[PDB]
């Protein structure tokens, strides 16, 4: 398994290799990769949720965001 946490089970949530907030794998085109920690985040799982993917070069997740 590429991921030791969920063993690549598609029917299992995994906050390590899929959305770090909800554990879901759907919509990878809508999953933002943090430029610091490299975790994935659905745009619609963020608080606040984004209606689209940001055009900006770099993006930092809520855990890494420098307030």
């Amino acid at each position: 398994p590429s991921c030791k946490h969920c063993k690549d089970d598609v029917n299992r949530l995994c906050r390590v290799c899929a959305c770090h907030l909800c554990g879901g794998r759907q919509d990878p085109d809508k999953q933002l990769m943090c430029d610091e920690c490299d975790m994935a985040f659905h745009i619609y799982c963020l608080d606040p949720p984004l209606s689209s993917v940001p055009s900006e070069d770099e993006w930092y997740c809520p855990e890494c965001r420098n307030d």
Binding site: P28, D29, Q31, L32, M33, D35, V53, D57, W59
Partner: peptide, 6 residues
Amino acid sequence: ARTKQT
């Protein structure tokens, strides 16, 4: 920004 798909 970079997505999972990329």
